[PDB]
Amino acid sequence: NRAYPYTRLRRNRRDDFSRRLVRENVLTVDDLILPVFVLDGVNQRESIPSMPGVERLSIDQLLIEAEEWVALGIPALALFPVTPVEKKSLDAAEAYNPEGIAQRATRALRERFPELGIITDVCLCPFTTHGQCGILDDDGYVLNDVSIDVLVRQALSHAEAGAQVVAPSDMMDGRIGAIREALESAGHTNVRVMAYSAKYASAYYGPFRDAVGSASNLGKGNKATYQMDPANSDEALHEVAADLAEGADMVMVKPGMPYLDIVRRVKDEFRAPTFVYQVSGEYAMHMGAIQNGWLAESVILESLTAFKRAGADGILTYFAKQAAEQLRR
Amino acid sequence: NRAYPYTRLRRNRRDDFSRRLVRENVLTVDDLILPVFVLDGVNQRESIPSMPGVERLSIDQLLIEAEEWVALGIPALALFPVTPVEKKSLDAAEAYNPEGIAQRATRALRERFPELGIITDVCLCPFTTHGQCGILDDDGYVLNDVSIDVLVRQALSHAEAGAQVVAPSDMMDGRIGAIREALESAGHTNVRVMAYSAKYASAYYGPFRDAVGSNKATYQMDPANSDEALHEVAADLAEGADMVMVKPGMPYLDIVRRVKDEFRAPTFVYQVSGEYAMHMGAIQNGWLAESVILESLTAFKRAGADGILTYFAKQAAEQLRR
Amino acid sequence: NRAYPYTRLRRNRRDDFSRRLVRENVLTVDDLILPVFVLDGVNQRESIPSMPGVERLSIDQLLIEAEEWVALGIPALALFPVTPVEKKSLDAAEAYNPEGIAQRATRALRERFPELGIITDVCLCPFTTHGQCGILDDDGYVLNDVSIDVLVRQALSHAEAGAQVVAPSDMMDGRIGAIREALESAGHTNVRVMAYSAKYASAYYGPFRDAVGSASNLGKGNKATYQMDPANSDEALHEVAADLAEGADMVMVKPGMPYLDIVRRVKDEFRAPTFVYQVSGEYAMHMGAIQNGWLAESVILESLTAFKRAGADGILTYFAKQAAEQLRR
Amino acid sequence: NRAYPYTRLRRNRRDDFSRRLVRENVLTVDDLILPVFVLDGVNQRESIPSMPGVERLSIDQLLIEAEEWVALGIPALALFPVTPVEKKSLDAAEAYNPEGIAQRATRALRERFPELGIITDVCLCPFTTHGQCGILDDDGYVLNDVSIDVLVRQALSHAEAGAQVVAPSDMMDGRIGAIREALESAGHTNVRVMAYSAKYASAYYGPFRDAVGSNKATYQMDPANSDEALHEVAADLAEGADMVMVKPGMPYLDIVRRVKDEFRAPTFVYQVSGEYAMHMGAIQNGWLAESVILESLTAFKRAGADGILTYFAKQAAEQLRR
Amino acid sequence: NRAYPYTRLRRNRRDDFSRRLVRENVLTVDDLILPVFVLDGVNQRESIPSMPGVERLSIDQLLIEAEEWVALGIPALALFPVTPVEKKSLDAAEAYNPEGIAQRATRALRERFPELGIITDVCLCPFTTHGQCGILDDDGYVLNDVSIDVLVRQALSHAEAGAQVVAPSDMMDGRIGAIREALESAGHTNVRVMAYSAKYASAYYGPFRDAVGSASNLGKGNKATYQMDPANSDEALHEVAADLAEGADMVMVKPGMPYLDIVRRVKDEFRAPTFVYQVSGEYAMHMGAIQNGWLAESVILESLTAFKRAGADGILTYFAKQAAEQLRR
Amino acid sequence: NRAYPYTRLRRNRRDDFSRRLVRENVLTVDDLILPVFVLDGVNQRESIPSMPGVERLSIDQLLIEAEEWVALGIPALALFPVTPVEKKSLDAAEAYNPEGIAQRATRALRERFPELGIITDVCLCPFTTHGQCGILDDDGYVLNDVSIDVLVRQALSHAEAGAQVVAPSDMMDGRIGAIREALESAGHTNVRVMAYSAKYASAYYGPFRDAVGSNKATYQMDPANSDEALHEVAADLAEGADMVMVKPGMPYLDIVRRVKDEFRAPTFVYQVSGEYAMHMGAIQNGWLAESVILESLTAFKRAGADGILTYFAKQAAEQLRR
Ligand SMILES: [K+]
Ligand SMILES: [K+]
Ligand SMILES: [K+]
Ligand SMILES: [K+]
Ligand SMILES: [K+]
Ligand SMILES: [K+]
Ligand SMILES: [Mg+2]
Ligand SMILES: [Mg+2]
Ligand SMILES: [Mg+2]
Ligand SMILES: [Mg+2]
Ligand SMILES: [Mg+2]
Ligand SMILES: [Mg+2]
Ligand SMILES: [Zn+2]
Ligand SMILES: [Zn+2]
Ligand SMILES: [Zn+2]
Ligand SMILES: [Zn+2]
Ligand SMILES: [Zn+2]
Ligand SMILES: [Zn+2]
């Protein structure tokens, strides 16, 4: 077998040209999806202290910023509405309002940038008073199938708005198949479904809850009855297997860097289009450190390259614009 | 053929007791290795700007703190000496000095806490004036085999100091074999070698450089590369490593998983200074809860590590003790 | 490859700290399920000569003992009723009596210890005059589908009583799917089904039959037309595959130590939550030897560690309390 | 259990943006190696009838063109000397001449473009009067081990000329090991060996023979054979190859795929002169669009090559630069 | 392991007899399928400049040429009609005309050469004014399921004409299963379906479009919304898996030589009858080079041997007659 | 998820043309090796009672028949000498006699038919007075390493006679390595070694013993054993075998399949004398049709053999020539 000194693995590392020739993975703009927090109103722009460099944008402002995103070649945006407090309810009806932020935003971006992919978020958590991803029963448990009925209405409203991709982020069992059935019935033949398949009950989501405004709603609440236990890996494969059987066109792991092993297993086992979410707390961690001068800016591309190496096709990342700028070089 | 609604994966999630029964991985104190930066003087600690909460410790201070580490059940420490500048050189001779910080610290700990594992760092980077992990040729290239010769002498001095484990962190080709041969030939039959097998040229290392007081793409691995890590580990195991390590850690969990799956050998991971600093800074800014520490360490276990070198070891152990 | 003396596998064994660092498996209280034999009546406690240290307990006494079990962190109990002789019948109707021991016990423990998992036993063998796990036809054969109908009524009665888990221990073909269908229809969405998937026709069950009082009923009778032939391993994988397809949330091998290879194959092949039953005769064997001074008490944890190493997530064991005490340490 | 119509594989195909997101492989300039035929004189180029658009270049001409190659980001060139007839012989001595074309070209390039990789060809076929890749016995059989001895001397001369990679294309058994040993023994520690591991006796080579100015079934592999290619690569890797190559290319993509999957090692492929000529002739006749060039090179990536030796390298790189 | 010089892999190569003994693959006439372009009319023969040596043939002329093809042992022909311009339409109705070229041709060859396999082409592209493989909606998108309805009518018309094999080359999702269902319903129990499973959106098809006369129709148009992205390999396995589930008797990769890795993966993964199409541009490339004297004629058999080695059972190739002649030797 | 009636496996069976297209394996003349029993005299043949239709042939008779074998395309013969009794001994010296039958036959064939492969039998069993495959100790045990020494000398004499392949049939441990080393050391670089790797102690051998004019459970394998065959082949390949063989054949097709799948190496199978006699006797009694011959040989191909040693080779080749 390979043995020193006949094999010296430093030889390929000796020069840039050979490191290039043997380099196993490369990040390109084709791998990047930009999540964006969308405000109601006009000429609104809000900094998020726990996500330095990220702004919530009203739709007019989103349209302006999207010019450069498109110019940079970023394939898709993932939209997250910042729902006004008074539009939150127990029944999460705003989720399917044709005049909801997500729906208005989608329509606006679809008209303005016909080639830009818009991935909407299918979940009730921006819409509930309690901040849970589904509807609660009288014991305070997030009901599975009752929640799916609302998610289905939501997803159809997104498809009606022109979204090319809906991304159910809710972790109810069976929701992919229910959404697929409804889209197919309704003639939304080519609306993709990007399932959040292995989405963990994680501490890395804090900043997002602040960004979208669910943090105050959820309070100290937890999602361990639906989001996955961080300890578990084999279980992720069963989650993905179900979602592919149910018709997902893409499957996602969330969070990201703390779960690269799950990305790798999922790509290896299913050989399907595999996505990963570099979550708010990941972005915040890195930004915090960069701004303190503790880590060089080169960590950005290293973090994103890791997702490629681990087997992701596409990466939802708040660093998408900076990454794409650096890639353009 | 598991399918909704016959299969509802939420059933097991419904209650704590069923989550606990099916829980696939559990971090324990047996998984933790505490890295520590060791100063030369007496009655001294220094704070590290880029590593909030971590202190460089003189040996007397190290012995005081190790009393609590041992009481918490932490199995081992990884020592990193902070070499005084005056002792740095081109030839890295201080690395094998019998009275160098690492050697002194090792002797003092082995005597006070005989059951505590001591993992020394076998590398020239704390000892070179230029801070590269090996000896430079006249073009500034880190010479492989000449570097090994120094590493070997270093490793022997650690064994003589009583280290139970030496950990070559240098990424020279072939060093694990060289060091093993030397140890065996010297009668240090039971000194373990914890190879840093897949160590990447990473931006996540900056804070550790500030900590120890110390451009490596010709020896450390390209972050893009995964298959190559398997070839690295294979060689190290062939060469006699008792344990193999991936570094950095979280940014490389896929590597951990592949390594464990491929070789079924004792597998370690280093949650490096950058990973610590990013997490602790976010926790301190109030952007992330403290629970992220155990989540990050659980990830290593899930990914297949047996042990984790982490600056959170004490905090984690305390939380486990609850 | 790895060769002596470059590789000396004693090096990691040289010290406790390194044995700890490399130790591949660890038993925790999270792995333990306590089976308990439950009597009718009040203030009843009965020693079982063939299970030294084990008592059958009336429900009041069970409630008292369960205080310490909970205090010790044991996640779940598995209940086995000791059915009064006169309540045994050909039709096993007591199996679904809402006032049966198992049902009363379940209700009592669910109220008193809301977080404690209760796993009920779905089988007709405590209820038949003949001691077989199903209903007999006129040739004395245990009818498959007729027995399932009774098992379904039983399982529903358990769910109605509040059990979080029902565990069909009967080995009829297809019963998992029938029970799942009935639970789903009835709205018992989150009642787990712990299938006894690979349950062998074993000699190690003797003491249990004495403990629950089926021994006198079964007499010299055998279960080779439904329980699996000890010789067979590949067949266990087909049993588990069916039960997972039919909706089991967990799958079990029984007995345990004499079948660790089956545990290993089952975990490796399916990557599903895998349980194992350290049966009465296993417990008795070990206790007998410990009390004779032939084996040290350390054999307890070694036996349980073996299940972890072989791939079990959870272990039904009469040693659960002692184990948990030792773990608490 | 993916099934229509829940699964419709056209959904991802519906839009450019989703095609791009799920696109499994992407050719980049980092994948390209440009082979070049090098003439002996000064201020000279020659057109090659069977390779439209490819020119033989004198070294001064090579240096001019390499300026654009380097600007386009092409990582490396593969040099093939066009040996003047007068310098051919039975003993192939010209192969290790310090002033042979390959050596001269290597020195000139290493000096002008220090970052550009130079891959020399280690083989006797440009040097033998008979054009076989090795030294003939009196029955016309290409002697294995006697040939190796010449190849070794050749390889050393290339290392001395500063080649970063030597590529034995000769298909003698055992040569990779012999050459590695020689390089190591001479102190050329970092010279890579790119073994032509699975090189077939193929009809696709004709045009290259016209290009260089140079019946091989006793050494080159039978096109029918696939398992045998794995045994070839295994030996080469054991023997110290840093990279392994399949040749020809497109007609052997299944070989590329198996090799990559089996060994997870740096894998290269040669789109040979015939493959080039067939494509360029069809493109010129107007029978195939220019887009076939990138399609053919994308295939190599999909099949698992890390790098591709291709006469289209410049054209491809230019198109990538868009 | 195997090491030089104990192992010298040249030894088996030393002599023809040992190369023969160890030769891993051999091409035979049993592997060859001859595609043929079929004209309307009588006594028509047309050379195709971009496919030197290939002629379009009216059916009388096809019948004459088929004598030698049969004499040579070629198992099957694949028919491609050259539809008259004026019979092209938006609705592609000519596709199912019982008096269409393909149908007439099939009937003629089935009567004359009862043992010769006839594989008809199921696709709408020879029949549409726009040259796309399906029916367009008002956005110019090739509608999936509406196109299948036409393909089904087409395939049934072929079966009625006596074709033993229909080969859907259209790349609509789900068409294999729809065609299979229709054939089964109609009593065409033994009509094979040779699915073009992994058919890529390739530049190598140019000459065929000229040969059949779709080139002028398609113009600069592309098929990237249905034909596969050349970059993608894992996706081919999902395409084949679906087609086998849907009832394909054979599966095909197209193009061929530029996709041999896909052939290999497909054979290895499914162990099913696997076919590959050496497309017009492949044939043209090689012929061009042979006629220029750049490549020896021996490249023909080398190219075809490659398909065998890569795992194909059968090869659609314009070189079939020459190959078969050489094989006859 | 293939299921009736969407999947009907009879569709492909419906017509000859589709059966031919999907047909997974095809016997060709390239797969056939003809074993032949060679007598010492001149102008002589002998019929073998237990092998109807097979004749022992003097060398002049062998040369006459080989003309048709060569015309039929049979690639190689396997020679088995029928040693005159007077030349048998305890020390098996006749095995390496330069004028022994095998050597004479080899020279005569190599000269007349230079393209025909000649596979000689390396074993002592035609040469020992007791008919065991090796040299006996005083307890009647077949000595392993002492036997090898004779086999080696035998093998060298065959190489000197011009055999292209030597086939050790002896089942001594380690002989393949010993023989390879000897051949290489003597300069017989290209002599192939076709190891009888998995050769079973079988009842199917009786007729061959009558044919050659020659209780083996201490060297030949137990018919019960399959995993053990993999270990046998692994060693032989490590030791330098160019080809590996299973013997007997049909009764061991599962072994062929495992061997091919595990090692992907050139794999051979011997349809032994018993297998021939059972088939030919049934064919002659009219109990089985002649078509069983091609069916039996097709089985070997399906099972994964590259080549088949069969007494039906001529008949098969003739049928193939149709
Ligand atoms: K590359
Ligand atoms: K557990
Ligand atoms: K551990
Ligand atoms: K991508
Ligand atoms: K053969
Ligand atoms: K075939
Ligand atoms: Mg799910
Ligand atoms: Mg290394
Ligand atoms: Mg069952
Ligand atoms: Mg070779
Ligand atoms: Mg398809
Ligand atoms: Mg042997
Ligand atoms: Zn949500
Ligand atoms: Zn260092
Ligand atoms: Zn029972
Ligand atoms: Zn050559
Ligand atoms: Zn078409
Ligand atoms: Zn013998």
Side-chain angles (χ1 to χ4, degrees), chain E residues 2 13 66 93-94 104 109 166 208 216 236 274 302 317 325:
Chain E
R2 306 181 78 199
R13 303 193 188 121
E94 186 64 13
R104 291 178 356 242
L109 280 161
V166 299
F208 173 94
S216 78
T274 304
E302 180 177 339
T317 171
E325 281 170 340

Side-chain angles (χ1 to χ4, degrees), chain B:
Chain B
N1 326 104
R2 299 186 81 192
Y4 173 90
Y6 283 86
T7 301
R8 285 168 186 273
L9 300 168
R10 291 182 67 203
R11 307 194 190 96
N12 285 332
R13 300 192 195 121
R14 177 63 186 86
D15 301 295
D16 179 54
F17 82 90
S18 56
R19 294 191 301 262
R20 291 173 58 209
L21 286 167
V22 304
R23 185 163 288 144
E24 295 175 23
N25 294 283
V26 153
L27 180 78
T28 75
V29 70
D30 291 347
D31 300 330
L32 299 178
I33 300 168
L34 183 152
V36 298
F37 293 111
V38 191
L39 293 173
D40 195 46
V42 49
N43 207 196
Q44 281 181 347
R45 295 195 195 202
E46 297 174 353
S47 296
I48 300 165
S50 64
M51 296 176 74
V54 174
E55 293 163 340
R56 311 192 190 96
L57 308 179
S58 63
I59 292 167
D60 66 295
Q61 294 297 301
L62 175 67
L63 300 168
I64 285 168
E65 287 309 317
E67 189 125 337
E68 188 50 13
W69 305 331
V70 166
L72 286 164
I74 291 170
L77 311 181
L79 308 176
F80 296 93
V82 181
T83 300
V85 70
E86 294 93 359
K87 312 216 164 65
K88 297 178 185 197
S89 66
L90 292 178
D91 73 357
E94 181 68 7
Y96 51 85
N97 186 345
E99 302 249 82
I101 287 160
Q103 291 83 0
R104 295 188 336 260
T106 296
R107 287 193 292 265
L109 290 160
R110 294 293 296 110
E111 172 177 52
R112 197 143 327 155
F113 303 105
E115 293 301 305
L116 179 56
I118 306 302
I119 305 166
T120 57
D121 185 45
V122 167
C123 199
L124 308 186
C125 66
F127 312 96
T128 54
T129 49
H130 48 79
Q132 295 284 330
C133 294
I135 299 307
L136 296 191
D137 70 15
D138 298 330
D139 297 304
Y141 180 72
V142 175
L143 287 163
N144 199 85
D145 291 354
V146 169
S147 300
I148 290 176
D149 295 334
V150 192
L151 296 163
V152 160
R153 294 185 79 174
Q154 175 180 39
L156 289 170
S157 70
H158 297 165
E160 286 167 13
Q164 308 102 315
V165 193
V166 302
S169 70
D170 59 284
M171 290 289 286
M172 299 301 85
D173 297 331
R175 88 284 207 193
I176 299 307
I179 282 164
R180 175 59 70 217
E181 280 165 356
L183 291 165
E184 283 290 313
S185 280
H188 298 293
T189 304
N190 292 314
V191 174
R192 280 120 285 178
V193 171
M194 180 175 284
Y196 280 71
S197 291
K199 181 173 172 177
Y200 288 86
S202 182
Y204 294 93
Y205 296 150
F208 164 101
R209 295 157 177 191
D210 301 335
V212 293
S214 68
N215 44 253
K216 312 205 172 190
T218 71
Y219 47 112
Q220 298 169 353
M221 288 180 67
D222 185 337
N225 296 354
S226 178
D227 288 341
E228 189 185 10
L230 292 181
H231 292 279
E232 282 285 354
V233 169
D236 294 346
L237 283 169
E239 287 171 38
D242 307 289
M243 306 106 154
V244 295
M245 196 203 302
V246 181
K247 174 170 177 198
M250 172 164 295
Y252 296 91
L253 292 170
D254 54 306
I255 310 299
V256 179
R257 181 69 274 159
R258 291 194 78 194
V259 164
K260 170 58 55 156
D261 289 344
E262 191 70 35
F263 301 100
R264 302 288 172 203
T267 302
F268 293 76
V269 67
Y270 205 142
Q271 186 182 51
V272 305
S273 57
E275 292 171 67
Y276 172 86
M278 85 184 157
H279 280 86
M280 192 61 119
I283 286 163
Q284 293 184 164
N285 291 354
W287 298 345
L288 287 181
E290 256 182 44
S291 65
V292 75
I293 300 160
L294 292 181
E295 187 172 339
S296 76
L297 298 178
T298 297
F300 297 123
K301 297 302 302 301
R302 185 193 61 246
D306 301 292
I308 308 150
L309 297 81
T310 171
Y311 300 98
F312 293 121
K314 187 184 183 178
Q315 302 95 291
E318 281 177 331
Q319 292 186 225
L320 301 165
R321 210 197 206 166
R322 311 273 60 205

Side-chain angles (χ1 to χ4, degrees), chain A residues 242-260:
Chain A
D243 295 342
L244 288 168
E246 293 174 29
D249 302 290
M250 301 106 153
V251 293
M252 198 201 305
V253 179
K254 174 176 181 192
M257 186 139 310
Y259 300 85
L260 288 176

